[PDB]
């Protein structure tokens, strides 16, 4: 057979935009240490207070998302100029990260110890408001739990399954966050939305960037557990209202 004619026939084959974009979404890409190094090195090489920049990139990721070029078209010139600055120095991208790629989501994840304190102040300004989560759970949902990056500080190996309880309590927020950012999931069931995120969210909890003792101190400072490792009432009630949605 003639193989030049075989490859030539690909000119007359479907390059469907819908199917092509579907294949690239599934073959998707994590990396905590290298994100911290790249932000500090590129920030200081441009002579910036990269510490202050990390805070700004975190707050920008919590209120507008992971599409820097898209949010800049719906923002004041005051904010849009700061966005263009941080995109230049840190070479930010729109998602689907690589080995050395920096995204607004990966900054909030690697620098989660500050995200968990900014959640105390931004609960009413998030895509899913803190009062809404206060309505989904029968109590005041822990503000420390209102972003996926919280899973990076969850030690599943904590005694008496509290690490799995915190995870279950965290999942009650995760399902409603995924429904808002993916409109196709708004008609799915609670367990169908759960199966969509429990794989990368799990890899974060099983991550070893932080030790068991770091995550332990982290949860103590923000009020999820105490020095005696006693869960706050808002955690266990949100977890059992999550297990009810999945069970």
């Amino acid at each position, epitope marked *: 057979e003639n193989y030049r004619d075989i490859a030539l026939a690909f000119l007359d084959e479907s390059a469907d935009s819908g199917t092509i974009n579907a294949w690239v979404n599934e073959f998707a890409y994590f990396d905590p240490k290298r994100i911290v190094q790249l932000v500090k090195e590129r920030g200081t090489a441009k002579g910036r207070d990269w510490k202050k920049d990390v805070k700004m990139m975190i707050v920008l990721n919590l209120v507008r998302g992971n599409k820097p070029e898209a949010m800049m078209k719906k923002m004041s010139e005051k904010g849009a100029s700061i966005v263009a600055n941080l995109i230049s120095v840190y070479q930010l991208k729109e998602g689907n990260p690589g080995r050395d790629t920096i995204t607004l989501s990966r900054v909030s994840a690697a620098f989660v110890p500050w995200t968990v304190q900014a959640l105390r102040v931004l609960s009413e300004s998030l895509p899913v408001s803190g009062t809404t989560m206060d309505a989904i759970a029968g109590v005041t949902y822990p503000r420390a739990m209102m972003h996926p990056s919280f899973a990076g500080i969850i030690d599943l190996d904590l005694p008496n399954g509290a690490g799995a309880t915190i995870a279950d309590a965290h999942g009650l927020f995760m399902i409603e966050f995924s429904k808002t950012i993916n409109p196709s999931l708004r008609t799915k069931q609670a*367990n169908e939305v*759960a199966a969509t995120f*429990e794989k990368p969210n799990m890899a974060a909890m099983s991550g070893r960037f932080f030790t068991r003792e770091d995550k332990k101190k982290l949860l103590i400072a923000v009020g999820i557990i105490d020095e005696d490792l006693v869960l706050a009432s808002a955690v266990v009630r949100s977890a059992e209202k999550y297990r009810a949605k999945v*069970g």
Partner: nanobody
Framework: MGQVQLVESGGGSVQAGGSLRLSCAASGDRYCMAWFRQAPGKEREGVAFISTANGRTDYVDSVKGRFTISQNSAKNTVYLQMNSLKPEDTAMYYC???????????????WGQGTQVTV
């Protein structure tokens, strides 16, 4: 040598309409415990499971009501009470403890050697 080791017991030959109790001793570790069975020639299928906190328990549709899964948190053992056995229940029964908290019905991790029942 494994972090988790499972040993099932209680399998035997029982006439149709009888009942036997399977027990599984755990060693090394909080998890959702599931009983699976595989008849000769057929594929291994799920029978029962219970949640980590013991609040939720679920059985496959073929054996629902007839089978009863339970656990003694003190002795760290899982039981499978099987009543009204049928010839189709003839299979080797295994125990599992996959994943962790979030879902409830994982599929296919630590396994035991299994035990055979014949009806």
């Amino acid at each position: 040598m494994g972090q988790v080791q499972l040993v099932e017991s209680g399998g035997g030959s029982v006439q149709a309409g009888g009942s036997l109790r399977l027990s599984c001793a755990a060693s090394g570790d909080r998890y959702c415990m599931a009983w699976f069975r595989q008849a000769p020639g057929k594929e291994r299928e799920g029978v029962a499971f219970i949640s980590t906190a013991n609040g939720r328990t679920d059985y496959v549709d073929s054996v629902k009501g007839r089978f009863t899964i339970s656990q003694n948190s003190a002795k760290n053992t899982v039981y499978l009470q099987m009543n009204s056995l049928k010839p189709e229940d003839t299979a080797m029964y295994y125990c599992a403890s996959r994943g962790y908290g979030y879902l409830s019905c994982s599929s296919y991790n630590y396994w035991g050697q299994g035990t055979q029942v014949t009806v």
